[PDB]
Structures are given as structure tokens and as C-alpha cells.
Design a protein around this ligand. Sequence first.
Ligand SMILES: NC(=O)C1=CN([C@@H]2O[C@H](COP(=O)(O)OP(=O)(O)OC[C@H]3O[C@@H](n4cnc5c(N)ncnc54)[C@H](OP(=O)(O)O)[C@@H]3O)[C@@H](O)[C@H]2O)C=CC1
Ligand SMILES: NC(=O)C1=CN([C@@H]2O[C@H](COP(=O)(O)OP(=O)(O)OC[C@H]3O[C@@H](n4cnc5c(N)ncnc54)[C@H](OP(=O)(O)O)[C@@H]3O)[C@@H](O)[C@H]2O)C=CC1
Ligand SMILES: NC(=O)C1=CN([C@@H]2O[C@H](COP(=O)(O)OP(=O)(O)OC[C@H]3O[C@@H](n4cnc5c(N)ncnc54)[C@H](OP(=O)(O)O)[C@@H]3O)[C@@H](O)[C@H]2O)C=CC1
Ligand SMILES: NC(=O)C1=CN([C@@H]2O[C@H](COP(=O)(O)OP(=O)(O)OC[C@H]3O[C@@H](n4cnc5c(N)ncnc54)[C@H](OP(=O)(O)O)[C@@H]3O)[C@@H](O)[C@H]2O)C=CC1
Lengths: 289, 289, 288, 288
Amino acid sequence: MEKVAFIGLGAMGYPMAGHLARRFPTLVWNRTFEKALRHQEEFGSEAVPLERVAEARVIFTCLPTTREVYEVAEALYPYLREGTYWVDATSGEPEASRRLAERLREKGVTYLDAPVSGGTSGAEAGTLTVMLGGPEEAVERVRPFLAYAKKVVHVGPVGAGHAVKAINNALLAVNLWAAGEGLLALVKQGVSAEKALEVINASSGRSNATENLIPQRVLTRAFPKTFALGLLVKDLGIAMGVLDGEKAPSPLLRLAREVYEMAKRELGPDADHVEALRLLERWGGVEIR
Amino acid sequence: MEKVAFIGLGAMGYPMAGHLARRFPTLVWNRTFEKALRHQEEFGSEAVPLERVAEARVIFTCLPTTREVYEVAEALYPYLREGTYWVDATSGEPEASRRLAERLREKGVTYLDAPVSGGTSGAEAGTLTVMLGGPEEAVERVRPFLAYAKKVVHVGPVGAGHAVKAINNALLAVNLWAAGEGLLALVKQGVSAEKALEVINASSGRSNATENLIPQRVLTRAFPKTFALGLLVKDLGIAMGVLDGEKAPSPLLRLAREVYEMAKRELGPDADHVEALRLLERWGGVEIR
Amino acid sequence: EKVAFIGLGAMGYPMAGHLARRFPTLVWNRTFEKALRHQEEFGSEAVPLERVAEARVIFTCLPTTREVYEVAEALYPYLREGTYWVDATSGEPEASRRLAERLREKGVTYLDAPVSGGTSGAEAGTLTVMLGGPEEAVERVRPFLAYAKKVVHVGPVGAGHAVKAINNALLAVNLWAAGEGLLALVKQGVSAEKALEVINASSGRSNATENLIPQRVLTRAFPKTFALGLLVKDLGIAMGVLDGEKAPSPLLRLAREVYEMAKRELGPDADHVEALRLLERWGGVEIR
Amino acid sequence: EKVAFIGLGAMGYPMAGHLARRFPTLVWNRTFEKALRHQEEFGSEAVPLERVAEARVIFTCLPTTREVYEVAEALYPYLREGTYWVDATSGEPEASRRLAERLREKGVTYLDAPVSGGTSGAEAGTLTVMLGGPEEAVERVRPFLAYAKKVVHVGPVGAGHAVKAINNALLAVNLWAAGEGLLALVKQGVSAEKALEVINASSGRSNATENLIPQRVLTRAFPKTFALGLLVKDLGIAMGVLDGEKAPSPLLRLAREVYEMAKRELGPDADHVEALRLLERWGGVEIR
Ligand SMILES: NC(=O)C1=CN([C@@H]2O[C@H](COP(=O)(O)OP(=O)(O)OC[C@H]3O[C@@H](n4cnc5c(N)ncnc54)[C@H](OP(=O)(O)O)[C@@H]3O)[C@@H](O)[C@H]2O)C=CC1
Ligand SMILES: NC(=O)C1=CN([C@@H]2O[C@H](COP(=O)(O)OP(=O)(O)OC[C@H]3O[C@@H](n4cnc5c(N)ncnc54)[C@H](OP(=O)(O)O)[C@@H]3O)[C@@H](O)[C@H]2O)C=CC1
Ligand SMILES: NC(=O)C1=CN([C@@H]2O[C@H](COP(=O)(O)OP(=O)(O)OC[C@H]3O[C@@H](n4cnc5c(N)ncnc54)[C@H](OP(=O)(O)O)[C@@H]3O)[C@@H](O)[C@H]2O)C=CC1
Ligand SMILES: NC(=O)C1=CN([C@@H]2O[C@H](COP(=O)(O)OP(=O)(O)OC[C@H]3O[C@@H](n4cnc5c(N)ncnc54)[C@H](OP(=O)(O)O)[C@@H]3O)[C@@H](O)[C@H]2O)C=CC1
């Protein structure tokens, strides 16, 4: 027999747990339990009280922040069995996560930070990129269970995964915002946004941002909700913590956190992350399309 | 075929004019006569004094800046004939170019800004990406003559081509520098720059910078010279002029010009643009690799 | 000798009042009612624009060099040789240099003479003046600056405007940075009153923390004395000064962009100090 | 009542001098020679670190909270109930709150009391003090602040450090922005001397342009009184204060980064004002 479990059935967790459920007997739990019941009916997982999650050989979590991961770890602490692996797909904090790992080790549980990239489309397709942090033996053991992933890279000990994820998202943030500033200026003087992007995406200034986010969500005015702006700002905050390690001159990334915070304050934490460009459109008095 | 003429036989112009020569009777001009004679002997073009360039149906220019384009336009003015087209491959200044376009229009000469991307490699291969600015009809008329290009995009009226070229390079600048800041922080905390990029290039933070510039030129320490840092700062200057049109809040792009200026002053204008990252390495006390 | 003042705005109205008490003063204003009002209040003489040419010294305090150029072109046909044009407008160095050339065609000597001290300074007649132009002309005009106290000759035509632009760029930075810091302190329970009491007796003090924030922000009064739109205009001129050498200027460059944000959200007619309300809106708290 | 001082540095040495001139003072320094020198000069008494616990009020002025904590742990087993700990170190609010709790275990009341006024202010005994802590404790220690003039109670433990950090961040921004502006002006032929004469009589004036730049930069004197490394440390603390609410603070955030550049290139041991030299190196001209 086999048994894994998933906690946190959100935008990412719901589809991620679906891949797990189709492959292994999977127990799922969600604060708003209705979501777990729906998941059971849709994928064949089994909705259970949080405590039963401790029955699994591999526990997965995809929560907002390390804060929530801590809460559920403390709730499960007395029931955790020796030999269990904890795969945290939360975009967490390196330091607080190293502490959590030490704490879980008290029960013989091996924590591995395993944040992902690829968004909800990647979660649904099961092609998420995973950046793992932790012991080499543990990493080898968990690979087969990552049913929702394609590219899996072991980047270092506990905390390195979250650190890499944070920096990756800070780069996405910077690339996206800069492209927004440039497109705003271009559109303002009669340049076709679509044609400009075709050029840019064939040139040196191309990025995932100009290739797969702006054309699809901004020019169309679709602005689909897939990744909360509040969560990206939270990621930028974690990236700032990574920069604090050595504090080498990092003018561009530091500022990136501040402009996205402006967007969060004006648009709300629940707007989609790409909607941050709407702030530039508001100031400019013109839409990017 | 109709006669064409190319002005400016530099690293880009020499090969570009070579592609034209293989298809049409081609007149070539270069400040330094030797280069034109060399081109004539190699491709069968015909080296001529500037004034004879007016014999062409289509005049092409690829000079350092709009200032040089102005100088040659001024000298040719008394000889320009109605029905002529002027394709400017120079990475020019949008506004100054629009003014030039009007003076040329008065002689019955239709100007189109047509900056290019793809570098000397693309010029040699004849696969350059062209961003055209100008009247629809004129664009239709000149497409058949762009023998050195593959992808040809009409981005807007006169000046739009130059604007997109400038903004593209500004985006490249930001993407590259930000990636430098983040990778520096990661390398400093023990994470392999190679491992970090493996994840990033398969994640949302990816860009041409992280995909094709940093791994090949920075991690390898090769730093091949393809585009001078001093020239990138110059393009950033043109990009700042584009931002000045509306002056909508553009903190990120504005800051980008300033940090690259720092690199230009400490590393020298002749260092390669990617070497700008050496400044981060110097401050960081560690190499990105 | 006779003098004249063009542009009776927030600064011009009181500035011309000081001239009127010392010299026969002719005044003109686009919205002529202000000139008539000025005549009744100070004893100056409201006159048609062309009559301004009667003066030995012409003063202007308009929004930008563009408006100064407009009135100069209008007066061109009437200007007399030997006349002086003292421009209190916060103008552009280059355009002003071209204006000086145009005016020399009529034998008129232009000098940029932008000021600092605000409307309170204009009313008190204690304005600081930064002059740009020939030293012979500077010496001839000094006696006429009845609305000024500290007067400094900083260089040739255009130098005064450049210094004013940089001065205001510093004011903007000091003001905004102070805002970001006070906001943070207020958020964690430290009153802006106590914080400023310390700051104004410490190394972080500036004219902004001493004479602007306590009086306009903590009181919630936000009086309108200097348009935010004009300060953004000044920052634009400062960016032009930075473009001369383009040496790394990250802080000043960023300053123009954040004040532009304030302008877009609060409007150009808000007071310059109201820029801090954008910080209050984002922070969800008042700086008090 | 007896007092004691730990950390006879650029600030500590003179500060403890003012104390020794009014109260029985015990002094200690890592490099004991300084303590002996102080004893000979002011009449204080150099003693082993452990003897400091004999004082009613213990004063410290070390590099960072890290050192204060280290000295605290060493003294912990000897601390007496009823003692007060006045920390003049420019410390971290959070770590200082933890330190206060630790000291409370021995019945010792900690108060953050960072200062402003530099070495000249310490020598003159006119330092501004920003106190964080219990009201009753503040009243008890006020009479012992012999090296201060203006003393403000800004909040509970940690608030003093928070205000100092923000104050210094404003100083840093004011200083650097002034550098960027003056550099541009000098490059176009305008004397920094003339520019500052105008600025210090205008809206852009600050303690930085009034008392640091003219005296240290224009003269090329660049005296060493406050390490660049310590200012960057203060900026780092300021960033931590900003992290409380994380309201948009682009200017102050950028300030930490440019001063870091100066530290990397000039070294943490250069004077804080020497940061402007980075601008001079890039600009290729001296600010005069
Ligand atoms: N969306 C994306 O594109 C990507 C997001 N991520 C990262 O994945 C993580 C989750 O993101 P996403 O799925 O969008 O988040 P959502 O906001 O969609 O979901 C958050 C989930 O966490 C649960 N939760 C919140 N608070 C608590 C709590 N106190 N106790 C228990 N459960 C709680 C929610 O329960 P409930 O249903 O009850 O509200 C919900 O299942 C984040 O760290 C994010 O940064 C990584 C890559 C991509
Ligand atoms: N190199 C690259 O990777 C790319 C460059 N570009 C753009 O192409 C343009 C030129 O670049 P590139 O070919 O590399 O330049 P080079 O420096 O190789 O060549 C410049 C050319 O301009 C001529 N020239 C210089 N000064 C004058 C003058 N005062 N009057 C007349 N001719 C003059 C030169 O003549 P002479 O031989 O006599 O010195 C030479 O032919 C620029 O606008 C650049 O931004 C676009 C994409 C890529
Ligand atoms: N306010 C302040 O605290 C300070 C302002 N300055 C500088 O002084 C200058 C004026 O500022 P301020 O007095 O506040 O401005 P206001 O907006 O109060 O006044 C502007 C004045 O210019 C006139 N004007 C505008 N357009 C035209 C035009 N096309 N032709 C003729 N007159 C015109 C107005 O006429 P009308 O009455 O008809 O509207 C008015 O008299 C600016 O350059 C500003 O940056 C310098 C220091 C301080
Ligand atoms: N200089 C200024 O203008 C101002 C400085 N401040 C703040 O005051 C504090 C001290 O600054 P300043 O006096 O210039 O510093 P200095 O570098 O001059 O002196 C530091 C002092 O701390 C001592 N010290 C360092 N490390 C240790 C340790 N591990 N254990 C015990 N003692 C140690 C030194 O001992 P030793 O002699 O043995 O090396 C020395 O007495 C800082 O927090 C600074 O930011 C505040 C206002 C102004």
C-alpha cells in the first residue's frame, strides 16, 4: 500500500493534489473543507480531518506563507510519525523554513522546501518546475512522488529552494514592470503595442513576461486571476530578505518591491499579479493594447 | 531590378549592403573610401561619391546616430529626386527623425525608420529583424528591397521604429542587470549560479538575458565583445528621450540608465555591455559563476 | 526710474507690491482684473501690455519660459534700447539663453533671476535671488530688487535658472524622503510631532522638516501656495541640468518620477507639499 | 550616585568626560589603554568590565546592538537590581527590545538613548537624545545626561533607536542628493560655493548642505568623525524600520544601496561624508 497527503487546495494546491490523487491513494485537507469534498469527487482523493494527514508517508503543503505552514505543522506535530517526508510547495522564507525543518526533525520528519514555477496552467498540466532544498537522499526519495512536475532541480540544502524561487519571482516582477513602463511610453506616441511586442519577442529584450504574460493578459484586457498580486509582493519581500544576506548593491530589485507595493495598495492584494501594470495605465491615462 | 544605394559600410552596413548587391544594382558609400572599394571588389556593388547616391530608387543608411544621418541628408538635399525612398537602419532618435522625414518629404523622398536587431551575425546571415516606422503604402513598397532581413514588422508611423529599438535595448539592460543582482545574492549564499539559472530558465523569471547571455558569457568568463557598453548607454539615452514624450512615472527604466552609466564610468565605454555585470561582481567580491 | 511687472500671480502680486512702494510701478496681468486690483491696493499703475516698454526695468514671474517668450514677442515692437529684463520665472537655461539673444536685438539685457522663499517670502520681501547674466547688468539691477534680501550672482544667463532647478530638486527629495520616514514611524506608534521635534534638532533636519511638514502636514491644513504641477515642472528642468554631463544621479532621477505619480493622482493644482498625501493614501494613515 | 560608561570611542570618550565632570564615573574600554587615558584626563576610574555593575546607571556607546548584547551577557551575572542601562549606541529596535527583557531578568531597566550632533556635539555636551522606554525610567535618567542638551522621550524601548535610524536615513538622502545636484552644476561651470550660498538661503537647504558639505567637501578636508560603515549600518536599521509596514518607500530604499556602493569602493572606515567622493570619481570632477 501507499499513502500521500496534500494540505492547501488553493489555486495551485487544488490541481497539484489532483495529479497526486490520480497516481497514489491521496488524503486531502483544506481549511475550507468544502474544497476538499469537491476535490475528492473530482479526482478520487479522500477528504479527511487534518489529523489524518499524519498517516501519509509524504505530506505536501501549498499555503500562502511559511506562517501557515508553521500553524499546520504545529497542529500535526503530536501525530507525526517517524520516516515521513514533508514536501513544502509554499513559496516560503529560507530562514523560518530551516527552523521548521529542525522542529519537524524532532519527530523524525524530513522537511524539503519545494516551491514551484509555471503558474496554474502548469499545475493543471502537471509540468511545474520544482526547485528542491534539502538532503540528497531525501531529494532522491521524493522525486517519484512529484506527479505535478516536469523539471525538478536540487538547488541546495533546506532554504535554498525558497531562496531561488524568491529571486526568480523578483526577476519576473522586474521584467514585467519595466516592459510595462516601456510599452506605456510606446503606445502613448502611436506605436502598436502588439507589433512592438512581436519585435521585442524576436529581440534581445524578450522575457517570459513579454512573451507569455503581457500579450495574453494585458493586450487582450483579459487580466485573468491566477496569481494574487499580494502573493507576488510577499515573494518580493522574501527576495529582499535574500538580498539582505550580503547586502551587495541591488538598486533595481529593491525598487521593484516598492513599485509592486504601490500597485498592491491601489489595486488590492487580490487583483492578479499582472494587473500591477494597470497602475501604469492609470497614471498614463491610456491602456496597453 | 531598380537601383539601390547603401550609406555607411560599418560592421552592420558592410554585410547588409552585400545582400542588396546580390539582388540589385547597388551603389555604396562610406566616409573612408577604402571600405567602399573593398565592398565593390567583393560584391560587385559600385563605390561612388555621396552625391551619386541620389540616382537610387531606394537609399539605405546605417550610421552611428541620427546626427550623421542628418549630415548626409543635408549634403544630398540639392540632388534628391521625387519618388525616392530612404530606409534608415540607424538606431535613431524618434523626434529628430520625424523632422528629417518632413524635410525629405518636401523633396518627394519618403523616409522610413528601420532599425534592426540580430547583430553582426544576423547581418552576415541576412536574417535581421526590422522594425519599420512610416506610411503603410511606403512600407509595402520597401519590403521587397530588404534583402538583409527575415522578420519585417511595421510598428507604427515615422519614429516608431526607432522608439521600439531603444525600448528593446532598455528592457535588455534592465533584465540583464536585475538578473545580475539576484544571481549575485544567490551565489554569495552558496547556491550555484549554474543551478540557479537551470531553474530560472525553466521558470517565470526567464529572459534572453538569463537564457542566452549570462550562461554563455558570464559563467564561462568568456565575455565576448559584440556590443560596447558605451553604445548601450547611448541607446538607454535614446530610450530616456522616448520616456520624455509623456513623462509618465517610469522609475525602473530611469534608474536603469543611471546604473549602466556607473558601469560605463568604472569599466570604460569599450567594455562589452554584458561586462556591466563585472561591476556587480566587483562590489560583491565574487564572480557570477 | 520706472519699473514694470508682468505676471501678478501668487508670487508676482506681492513682489510687485514691494516695487510699487519704492518706484513708480506699471503692472500688467493677462487677467487684467488683478492689475486693477493691484493698482488700488499698492498705488502701482495698471497699463496695457505695450506700455510696459516705458520702464527701465521689466520684471516677469510667469509659469515657464514659454510664457516669458510669449510676452517678450508681444513687447518686441515696443522695447527700447537700454532696458533690463529681470526674469523671476523658474525657467529653462537654454531657452532663456535664446530669449536673451532675441532681446539683445532690441538692445534689452535679459537676466534670469529666479527666487526662493515662497509666497510668505514674497509677502515679507525677503526672497533669495539667484542671478544669471553679465556682471555689469547685475550691478545695475541690484538696487531694484525691493522684494529680495539675499542676492547672489551665480554665473552667465541660464545659471540662475539652473541653480533654482537644482535647489528645488533638493527640496523635493528632502520633503519626500522625510515623508517616507515619518510615515513608517507613525505606523509603529511614534507621533510625527515627537519625531520631528528630534529630527529638527538633529542631523536629518532640513527646511522641509522644519518649515513645511509641521505647518502644513501635521496640522492637516495643506495651504495652497506653490502648485505641485509647477514643482514637477521644476524637477523636469533639473533633469535637463543632469543631462548636461549625465553623471550617475539615481536619487534625483527617481525624485521626478515619484512627484509625477503625485501629480497624476492629486492633480497639478494641489499644493506641492500635498505630494505627501500620496504616501498617506498608500500607507493608510495620516502623518501626524 | 555612581555612573559607568562602556565604549570610549569617538563618541564615548568625550561623552564619558561630561559625566566624569559631574558624577563619580567608572569607565571601561575593550582597548583598556583608552580607559586609563580617560581616567588621567577626566578623573574617571578605569576598572575591569565586571566592576561596572557597581554603578546606578550604566552607559554604552558601541558599534551595534551586537556588541551591547555581548557586554551585557558578560555583565549579566553581576548586575544589581534597580540599575539603569542607558544605551547611546545607534541600535536595532527589535534586538534592543529583546535585550531589555534579558536585562529585566536582573532587575535592570534598559532605555535606548541614541544621539545626534556628531563628535563636535559630544565634545560640547550638546547632543540631542531620543529616549525609548518607561516614563518613570526616563524621569530617573534625565538628570544624568550631562552630555546632552535637547532630550526627547519618543516612545517605549526601541522607539529611540527607530527615530535615530530614520533621522540618519534622512541625513544620508539629503547629503547624497545634494552631491548629485552640486556635481551637475559644477560640471556646467557653476561654483559649488555659489550654488551652496544660494541653496543655504533657499528651500533646498538642510543640515547636510549647511554644516557638512561646505566644511568637509569644498575644502577637501574630509575629516574623519563618523565612519561610512556605521552610516550604512544605520541605513540598514532604517530599512528594518521601513519593513514594519512596508509602505512604498523608493527613495529611502535606494539610499541604502548607493551608500553601500560608496562603502564597497571607499571602505567602511572612510568618513560618512566621503561618500560624495564616489560621485566625484564617476563625475571626474571635485565638488568645489
Ligand atoms: N498562483 C500561482 O500562479 C503560483 C503560486 N505559488 C505560491 O503557492 C502558494 C499558494 O498560492 P495559491 O494557491 O495561489 O494560493 P490561494 O490563495 O489560491 O490558496 C491559499 C491556500 O492556503 C489555504 N490557507 C490560507 N490560510 C490558511 C490557514 N491559516 N490555515 C490553513 N490553510 C490556509 C487556503 O485555504 P482556503 O481555501 O480555506 O482559503 C488555500 O487552500 C503561495 O506561497 C504562492 O506564492 C507558486 C507558484 C505559482
Ligand atoms: N553592431 C551591432 O551589434 C548593431 C548596431 N546597430 C546600429 O547600427 C548603426 C551602426 O552600427 P555599426 O555598423 O556596428 O557601426 P560601426 O562603428 O561598425 O560603423 C559606423 C559606420 O558609420 C560611419 N561613420 C562614422 N562617423 C561618420 C560620420 N561622421 N559621417 C559619415 N559616416 C560616419 C563609419 O565610417 P568609417 O568607416 O569611415 O569610419 C562606419 O561605416 C548604429 O545606429 C547602431 O546602433 C543595430 C543592431 C546591431
Ligand atoms: N509659488 C511659489 O511658492 C513660488 C513660485 N516660483 C516660480 O514663479 C513662477 C510663477 O509662480 P506662481 O506665482 O506660483 O504662479 P501662479 O500660477 O500663481 O501665477 C502665474 C502667473 O502667470 C500668468 N500667466 C500664465 N499664463 C500666461 C500667459 N500665457 N500669458 C501671460 N501671463 C500668463 C498668470 O496670469 P493669470 O492671473 O491671468 O492667470 C499669473 O499672473 C513659476 O515659474 C514658479 O515655478 C518660485 C518660487 C516660489
Ligand atoms: N561618530 C559619530 O559622529 C556618531 C556615532 N553614533 C553611534 O555611536 C556608536 C559608536 O560610534 P563611534 O563612537 O563613532 O565609534 P568608534 O568606532 O569610534 O568606537 C566604537 C567603540 O566601541 C568599542 N567596541 C567595538 N567592538 C567592541 C566589542 N566587541 N566589545 C567591546 N567594545 C567594542 C570600541 O573599542 P576599542 O576602542 O577597543 O576599539 C570603541 O570604544 C555607533 O552606534 C554609531 O553609529 C551616533 C552619533 C554620532
